[PDB]
């Protein structure tokens, strides 16, 4: 097929809501029996957003191995991501336990702790160097080493320490602070500038465990981020970029976690980001600098 031509035909006819509902109708439905067990009721932020049993991340905990998190394993693209909900007050220890156990190097946060007067996620990382956090239930320590604040995103260097063994690991936290719930980024440039910062950090490298991506539910903004990244990888990977079918890729991702991409506009935005990102993939290396300037991260 031809991605760019497809985008124009859908956009000109204003048919995004149509294709999006088709995706919702065609999406996989698998059991989430573990997530629904009463004992895990308080481990879920939302009653309607649960990980499928087949792809859920298991804590190496003998007590209760449940966490609302899913392993999105993209075979052809050769990349895996863990999408999870924003940690709750009682699951912050579980979250970092998962990060440790899965050997993740980066955490991508797409929501804000407070969104329009409502808390979408617990303050699960230290805000100050001198006030480290200790998660007693999972025996982990977390310290803020440094932070680089930009206009619409912040990158933080954290030190995670397994208190049992005393081993320590550097975790990179990429916080997109201006992506509204059920909304889209300011521009493909802002989004791509952020994605490439994550990519360049080395966090998405196959030598590390899967990057952990979350929003409030771990499906809308999270799905948008992963879909774009995966489509860009497939584009760079195969013979013909135009061959990448964004809808087919999204349906594949939905086999691993329900509701990835929550609005038709998020779907539309995904196309925009992949189309613009493809410029860099085909050869234009200068575009990367254009995105950066267009993003106004210095502001």
């Amino acid at each position: 097929m031809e991605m760019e031509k497809e985008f124009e035909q859908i956009d000109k006819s204003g048919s995004w809501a149509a294709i999006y509902q088709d995706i919702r109708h065609e999406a996989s439905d698998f059991p989430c029996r573990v997530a629904k067990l009463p004992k895990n009721k308080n481990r879920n932020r939302y009653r309607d957003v649960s990980p499928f049993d087949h792809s859920r991340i298991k804590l190496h905990q003998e007590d209760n191995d449940y966490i609302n998190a899913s392993l999105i394993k993209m075979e052809e693209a050769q990349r895996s991501y863990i999408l999870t909900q924003g940690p709750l007050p009682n699951t912050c220890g579980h979250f970092w336990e998962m990060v440790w156990e899965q050997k993740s190097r980066g955490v991508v946060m797409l929501n804000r702790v407070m969104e329009k007067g409502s808390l979408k996620c617990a303050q699960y990382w230290p805000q100050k160097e001198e006030k480290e956090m200790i998660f007693e239930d999972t025996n982990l320590k977390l310290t803020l080493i440094s932070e680089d604040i930009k206009s619409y995103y912040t990158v933080r260097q954290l030190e995670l320490e397994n208190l049992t063994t005393q081993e320590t690991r550097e975790i990179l936290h990429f916080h997109y602070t201006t992506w509204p719930d059920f909304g889209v980024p300011e521009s493909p440039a802002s989004f791509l500038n952020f994605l490439f910062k994550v990519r360049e950090s080395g966090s998405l490298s196959p030598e590390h465990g899967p990057v952990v991506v979350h929003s409030s539910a771990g499906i809308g903004r999270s799905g948008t981020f992963c879909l774009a990244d995966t489509c860009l990888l497939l584009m760079d990977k195969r013979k013909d970029p135009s061959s990448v079918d964004i809808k087919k890729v999204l349906l594949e991702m939905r086999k691993f976690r329900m509701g990835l991409i929550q609005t038709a506009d998020q779907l539309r935005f995904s196309y925009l980001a992949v189309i613009e990102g493809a410029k860099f993939i085909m050869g234009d290396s200068s575009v990367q600098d254009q995105w950066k300037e267009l993003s106004h991260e210095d502001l």
């Binding site: 939302y46 957003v49 409502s118 059920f182 409030s216 539910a217 499906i219 509701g259």
Partner: peptide, 7 residues
């Protein structure tokens, strides 16, 4: 607040 999906 308990439900995230918008009808």
């Amino acid at each position: 607040a308990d439900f995230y999906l918008i009808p």
